[PDB]
Motif scaffolding. Structure first.
Motif, PDB file in Angstrom:
ATOM      1  N   UNK A  57       0.867  -1.193   0.000  1.00 48.14           N
ATOM      2  CA  UNK A  57       0.000   0.000   0.000  1.00 48.14           C
ATOM      3  C   UNK A  57       0.892   1.226   0.000  1.00 48.14           C
ATOM      4  N   UNK A  58       0.447   2.302  -0.633  1.00 46.43           N
ATOM      5  CA  UNK A  58       1.275   3.490  -0.631  1.00 46.43           C
ATOM      6  C   UNK A  58       1.427   4.086   0.770  1.00 46.43           C
ATOM      7  N   UNK A  59       2.526   4.823   0.959  1.00 47.69           N
ATOM      8  CA  UNK A  59       2.871   5.431   2.244  1.00 47.69           C
ATOM      9  C   UNK A  59       2.231   6.773   2.511  1.00 47.69           C
ATOM     10  N   UNK A  60       1.626   7.314   1.476  1.00 45.14           N
ATOM     11  CA  UNK A  60       0.990   8.638   1.515  1.00 45.14           C
ATOM     12  C   UNK A  60      -0.504   8.480   1.279  1.00 45.14           C
ATOM     13  N   UNK A  61      -1.308   9.400   1.835  1.00 46.69           N
ATOM     14  CA  UNK A  61      -2.769   9.339   1.685  1.00 46.69           C
ATOM     15  C   UNK A  61      -3.191   9.268   0.240  1.00 46.69           C
ATOM     16  N   UNK A  63      -3.270   6.118   1.056  1.00 50.60           N
ATOM     17  CA  UNK A  63      -2.618   4.842   1.414  1.00 50.60           C
ATOM     18  C   UNK A  63      -3.257   3.687   0.635  1.00 50.60           C
ATOM     19  N   UNK A  64      -3.460   3.883  -0.673  1.00 51.02           N
ATOM     20  CA  UNK A  64      -4.111   2.878  -1.503  1.00 51.02           C
ATOM     21  C   UNK A  64      -3.359   1.559  -1.609  1.00 51.02           C
ATOM     22  N   UNK A 105      -1.470   5.399  12.668  1.00 55.12           N
ATOM     23  CA  UNK A 105      -2.874   5.127  12.953  1.00 55.12           C
ATOM     24  C   UNK A 105      -3.764   5.336  11.745  1.00 55.12           C
ATOM     25  N   UNK A 106      -3.682   6.505  11.113  1.00 57.12           N
ATOM     26  CA  UNK A 106      -4.599   6.693   9.991  1.00 57.12           C
ATOM     27  C   UNK A 106      -4.332   5.771   8.811  1.00 57.12           C
ATOM     28  N   UNK A 107      -3.070   5.412   8.596  1.00 59.77           N
ATOM     29  CA  UNK A 107      -2.733   4.498   7.509  1.00 59.77           C
ATOM     30  C   UNK A 107      -3.305   3.130   7.816  1.00 59.77           C
ATOM     31  N   UNK A 108      -3.140   2.681   9.064  1.00 64.67           N
ATOM     32  CA  UNK A 108      -3.684   1.397   9.495  1.00 64.67           C
ATOM     33  C   UNK A 108      -5.210   1.383   9.281  1.00 64.67           C
TER      34      UNK A 108
END
Ligand SMILES: OC[C@H]1O[C@@H](O[C@H]2[C@H](O)[C@H](O)[C@H](O[C@H]3[C@H](O)[C@H](O)[C@@H](O)O[C@@H]3CO)O[C@@H]2CO)[C@@H](O)[C@@H](O)[C@@H]1O
Length: 308
Positions: A57-61, A63-64, A105-108
């Motif tokens: 998944x990508x590391x930036x929003x 986070x696709x 947290x938000x990526x998770x």
């Protein structure tokens, strides 16, 4: 009903050293479609599939999750469902989250939003396990908060699938008494991984510091048995008090342990979990803790008998 979902899980096996490596096959196992026929024919009711979504998944929003990988997970899940196996999927080896839960947290949560969106209409025999073995900076109290946030995300999208919630401090019994599952969530199973005595199960495990000092440790005395029963009684009392079903999602002894002790330990653990009506998944199918030889296409008969 989660207790009915626990009955549906029943006896299972992990297909490890596969999708939880950085890339599938890196750690020795590629999930072949025929493995599902092999596992179902042997008598297992489900498979647990460790998955390292974080490296796909990508590391930036936002986070696709990467397309090719999602397609691959779909292929694995569907291969298992085709045979009538129930399936547990999780998020495994997300180390950055353990080391800095605030940053990730938000990526998770974006990963769970995407996974729940992808599988919300799949059969009720698919189970979502929030996070394998919380540990480290993701302390017991931080895990109670993070798991509730994950539950909210998943339930905002899917109120059908049973969710599986582990314990902190590496997922065993030590932090069970600290686990808090929200009263509002009514369709979850609590999972515990059981590898005690750790020195016995992990003797010689190359990824465990100082494990060489345990090589040769045996298991099987009446006192070894009583100690294990004491620990299982602790888990059972917690389950009864908190009204949550139990799934021992991973248990097994490494290949460096002597075979006779491995058989005794494995067989005793299974008899005792079944007396408590718990579901479980052996660690694991065909790697370092394996019970099936993919080259000879044969099971270790005594270890298989211990399981089924
Ligand atoms: O196989 C080579 C590969 O091993 C890597 O170590 C892993 C082990 O092989 C196992 O896969 C081990 O499984 C653990 C699970 O992930 C869960 O924590 C729990 O179920 O316990 C099992 C057993 O300990 O995981 C380790 C990695 O943490 C690693 O050394 C790698 O570099 C190497 O190529």
């Amino acid at each position: 009903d989660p207790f009915e979902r626990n009955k549906i899980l029943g006896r299972g096996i992990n297909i490890g050293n596969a999708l939880e490596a950085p890339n599938e096959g890196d750690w020795g196992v590629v999930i072949k479609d025929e493995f599902f026929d092999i596992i179902k024919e042997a008598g297992f009711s489900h498979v647990r599939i460790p998955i390292r979504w974080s490296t796909h998944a990508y590391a930036f929003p936002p986070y696709k999750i990467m397309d090719r990988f999602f397609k691959r997970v779909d292929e694995v899940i569907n291969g298992a469902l085709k045979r009538g196996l129930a399936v547990v999927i999780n998020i495994h080896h997300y180390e950055e989250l353990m080391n800095d839960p605030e940053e990730h947290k938000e990526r998770f949560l974006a990963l769970w939003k995407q996974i729940a969106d992808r599988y919300k209409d799949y059969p009720e025999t698919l189970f979502f396990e929030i996070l394998n073995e919380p540990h480290g900076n993701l302390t017991p109290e931080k895990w109670n908060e993070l798991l509730e946030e994950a539950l909210k995300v998943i339930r905002s999208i899917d109120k059908k699938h049973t969710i599986i919630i582990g314990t902190a401090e590496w997922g065993g019994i030590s932090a069970l008494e600290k686990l808090s599952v929200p009263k509002w969530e009514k369709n979850s199973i609590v999972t515990i991984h059981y590898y005690n005595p750790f020195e016995f199960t992990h003797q010689g495990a190359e990824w465990v510091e100082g494990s060489e000092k345990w090589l040769g440790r045996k298991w099987g005395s009446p006192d070894d048995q009583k100690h294990l029963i004491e620990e299982f009684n602790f888990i059972e009392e917690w389950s009864k008090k908190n009204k949550r079903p139990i799934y021992i999602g991973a248990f097994g002894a490494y290949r460096k342990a002597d075979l006779e002790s491995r058989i005794k330990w494995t067989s005793f653990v299974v008899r005792e979990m079944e007396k408590r009506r718990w579901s479980w998944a052996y660690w694991e199918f065909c790697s370092g803790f394996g019970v099936y030889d993919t080259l000879r296409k044969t099971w270790n008969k005594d270890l298989l008998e211990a399981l089924i």
